Amino acid sequence: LLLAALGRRELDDRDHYGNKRLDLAGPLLAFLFRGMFKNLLKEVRIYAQKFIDRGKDFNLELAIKTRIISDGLKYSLATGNWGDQKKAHQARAGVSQVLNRLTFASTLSHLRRLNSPIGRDGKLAKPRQLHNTLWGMVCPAETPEGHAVGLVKNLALMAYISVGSQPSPILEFLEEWSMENLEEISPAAIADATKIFVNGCWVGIHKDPEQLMNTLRKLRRQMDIIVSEVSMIRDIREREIRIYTDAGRICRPLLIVEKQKLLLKKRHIDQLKEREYNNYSWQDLVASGVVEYIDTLEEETVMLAMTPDDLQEKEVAYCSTYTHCEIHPSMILGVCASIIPFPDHNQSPRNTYQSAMGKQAMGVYITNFHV
């Protein structure tokens, strides 16, 4: 707060996607189920109370009202109201929608849809504006043109949302490296030392952040302690290292560039080309440390080329220190926006309108349509 007030550090931006997480079907259902299960134990409590106050023995098989979970889950998934039916007018609506089976591209894009809980009819443009932080994560063209414009988004073709993992393996590795536990360190030592955050828990300080970052990246690139979803951000000017292992972080794969050269050499392409005979696959590409999942919060500190074959040679050096390279820049589009031929020769609203109409175009929507 002092830093911000002094102006030494810029304020945080609510629309920057590094500051956002997506609740997928998992955390959404866990949010209901937590409530229902707590209700189920409320009912076992009142039922057994009725039996045990009378000194009789309460049979739990009658105490469990099976229906609370069954009809609870079912209800909210059926209507889309994400909460207890008794208080339906207070909970979110439309979280669960009827799958659009009009055309295959509409089915695919509906399964890849993101929703911002911002109230409609809001005059503010900022939450609806295409923030730079959406590059490669969210399709820049596929959004409804109606009142929901910019609030309803769609994943880019290679956008992956982290499922999450426990931080304990990382914490153990940090504790065995030269990290001082926050409880052990002298406050005086925090001045000239980086502060390490794991899932937002400040867990220690480290004297040599550069070796730490190089080590943490090497681990992720070998898939051992650090699973590949984890994202380590090095805030140099801030002297902070933030490691995130939580769920819902939207990230995408990128090629690694160690010097002005891709780590992806012809041997990988050749093995990948044979993936029918030998089962060499994307997993081996990730495990060999050629590809990496960069997250938006981590992408603020990566220097990214667009195409290696032109942006790594030089005439007068522009960057000369790239760290990653785009696989193919067309991966920034979504499902409906990537069927457009030559979208880069079109005015962007036209691309948006085609993304909208590509979900209304008739065709064989599924092969078992006669069933």
């Binding site: 064989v364 092969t367 078992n368 006669h370 069933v371």
Partner: protein
């Protein structure tokens, strides 16, 4: 779903050419030489076999409600 009987634009019969085209493609013919072999000169007719997708082969995977 099934190869159209006639080219939508001009009317040339192309319904009898999908199997032949598949056989030509089973040989190493390039689709352009395949189309020339089948006698499709106008681009409207060539569009029929180049763009056709035989979905009836997928629909036949299902057991019939005899």
């Amino acid at each position: 779903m099934i190869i159209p009987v006639r080219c939508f634009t001009c009317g040339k019969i192309v319904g009898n050419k999908w199997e032949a085209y598949l056989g030509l493609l089973q040989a190493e013919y390039t689709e352009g030489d395949a189309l020339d072999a089948l006698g499709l000169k106008r681009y409207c007719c060539r569009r029929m076999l180049l763009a056709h997708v035989d979905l009836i082969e997928k629909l036949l995977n299902y057991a019939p409600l005899e």
